Amino acid sequence: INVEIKKIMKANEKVTSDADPMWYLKYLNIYVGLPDVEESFNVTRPVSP
Amino acid sequence: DPVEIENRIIELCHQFPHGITDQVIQNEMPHIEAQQRAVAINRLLSMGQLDLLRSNTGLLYRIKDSQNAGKMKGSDNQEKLVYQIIEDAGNKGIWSRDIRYKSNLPLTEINKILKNLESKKLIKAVKSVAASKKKVYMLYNLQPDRSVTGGAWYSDQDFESEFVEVLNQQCFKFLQSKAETARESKQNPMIQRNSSFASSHEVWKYICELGISKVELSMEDIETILNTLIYDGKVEMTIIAAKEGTVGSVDGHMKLYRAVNPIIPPTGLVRAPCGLCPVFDDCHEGGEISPSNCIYMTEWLEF
Amino acid sequence: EAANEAGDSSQDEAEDDVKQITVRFSRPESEQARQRRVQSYEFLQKKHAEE
Ligand code: SF4
């Protein structure tokens, strides 16, 4: 989660389509954050195991 | 100066749109060596303004098609890089899907190119009658081929079954009348056969004099109609040897058609409901489909 | 072998094999195909021969 995920994101950082050139989607940095639960209405909250 | 040599070659190509040969180039500029001329031609072909053609007289160097412009919006690069295969197809035409796959360009880009060319009158879109899926694009100057589009039978991508049936009926009536006249003449067997024989050109002129439809019907079209009649089992065709005459269609050969009666009348199998039954395979003594409680034979006996 | 196939007959008539204009499109090559062409052995051999 600290190094390998970043390396994979760097390997697949850029993705583009053949049609309509000059269009691309570039990934800069990926985060995992802390464990949260999607129970609340569009609100995050720390949840225990 | 190689730049001056290239400029002079381009000027000569402009003067001769059909192309120029090494002999013409040498006659125009004799003080330059063949090696320098070849280097100049190689540079021109590498930069992409000249095209090479191999004719019975040798090699021709023609200026690339750039003055004829139908899509000036954007860049002439894609314009010519589409017009190339547009012209290559020409009479046979090419579908939009094939144009896209050959150009490796987006659908929107190719559609814009085609629309601009059609607005500036360089290409025409015609519906493919063989497969009515997309409209093929052809050159506005070339005549549309009959196989890929058009045809004396097809009218607006619709086959004229009634028209072909009328043609067949009229041809069969004419051949039957001719055979009847030949039989009534009863002058000699060979003369009777020769008179019952009908020539392709003769039946074509007869159909033209009739004038059932407005579209011009060709001798080959009438020949195809007569071949369909033969396949129908009503006329017979014979190839005789005649050097030249009023037909002059085939070299040394002439096709003569005559209406002939069938070999034998309808057989006995067709006279029974069992021979014309579509579920004949499922026939069985004891079951749902049984000859005892059959409906086909019941109605056939009631009639 | 090509010359033999051509001279299979004693007298070869003038063949009407005029080279039709088969100018293919310089299609825009995708990045992957361009990298493949660059890494191909023929491209490297031609680059070495250019010198
Ligand atoms: S239903 Fe009667 S007529 Fe039809 S196939 Fe069977 S036996 Fe023959």
The answer as to CATH 1.10.10.10 being correct for domain B2-63 is yes
Q: Give dist(CA B23, CA B2) in Å, integer.
A: 19
For chain A, the three-class secondary structure string (H helix, E strand, C coil) is: CCCHHHHHHHHCCEEECCCCCCCEEECCCCCCCCCCCCCCCCCCCCCCC
B133 backbone dihedrals φ, ψ, rounded to 5°: -115, -50
| Contact present, B126 and B136 (Cβ < 8 Å) | yes
User: CA of C4, closest CA in chain B: separation in Å?
Assistant: 22
Q: In chain B, which among 10-69 make CB contacts under 8 A with chain C? A: 51, 53-56
Q: Give dist(CA B233, CA B245) in Å, integer.
A: 29
C21 alpha carbon – ligand 1 mean position (Å): 66
Instruction: Give the nearest chain C residue to B60 (CA atoms).
Output: C19
Helices (H), chain B: 2-15, 22-28, 34-47, 76-89, 96-103, 107-119, 161-185, 189-196, 200-210, 219-231, 295-302
Q: Give dist(CA B111, CA B96) in Å, integer.
A: 9
B298 alpha carbon – ligand 1 mean position (Å): 10
Contacts 24+ apart (CB under 8 A), B222-227: B222/B171, B223/B255, B225/B164, B225/B167, B225/B168, B225/B171, B226/B171, B226/B200, B226/B257
Q: Would an 8 Å CB–CB cutoff place B108 in contact with chain A?
A: yes
DSSP C1-51: -HHHHHTTSSS-------B-----------HHHHHHHHHSHHHHHHHHHH-
User: Any residues with CB less than 8 A from the CB of B131 and at least 6 apart, and which?
Assistant: none
Q: Give dist(CA B102, CA B98) in Å, integer.
A: 6
Here the tokens at position B118 are: 């059609």
Cross-chain Cβ contact B54/C21 below 8 Å: no
Cross-chain Cβ contact C14/B56 below 8 Å: yes
Where is the binding site, in residues of B?
274, 277, 283, 294
- Residues of B with CB below 8 A from A16's CB? none
- Residues of C with CB below 8 A from B51's CB? 21, 23
B264 alpha carbon – ligand 1 mean position (Å): 26
Other CB atoms within 10 Å distance of the CB of residue B217? 19
Residue B275 Cβ < 6 Å to ligand 1: no
**In the block, residue with structure tokens 């009534």:** B184
Technique used to solve these coordinates: cryo-EM
Write the burial class of residue B98 (CB in 10 Å: 0-12 exposed, 13-18 middle, 19+ buried): middle
Q: Collapsing DSSP states into helix, strand and coil, what is residue B123?
A: strand
User: Any residues with CB less than 8 A from the CB of B124 and at least 6 apart, and which?
Assistant: B118, B137, B138, B139, B140
How many CA atoms are closer than 13 Å to the CA of B131, on its beta-carbon side? Answer: 6
Q: Give dist(CA B241, CA B256) in Å, integer.
A: 11
Q: Would an 8 Å CB–CB cutoff place B75 in contact with chain A?
A: no
Beta bridge partner(s), residue B127: B135
The 10 Å CB-count burial string (b at 16+, else e) for C18-48 is eeeeeeeeeeeeeeeeeeeeeeeeeeeeeee
| Contact present, B31 and B20 (Cβ < 8 Å) | no
Resolution of the experimentally solved model in angstroms:
3.0
From the list C23, C29, C30, the residue facing B84 with the nearest CB is: C23
Q: Give dist(CA B12, CA B4) in Å, integer.
A: 12
Give the residue whose CA is nearest to atom 3 of ligand 1. Answer: B274
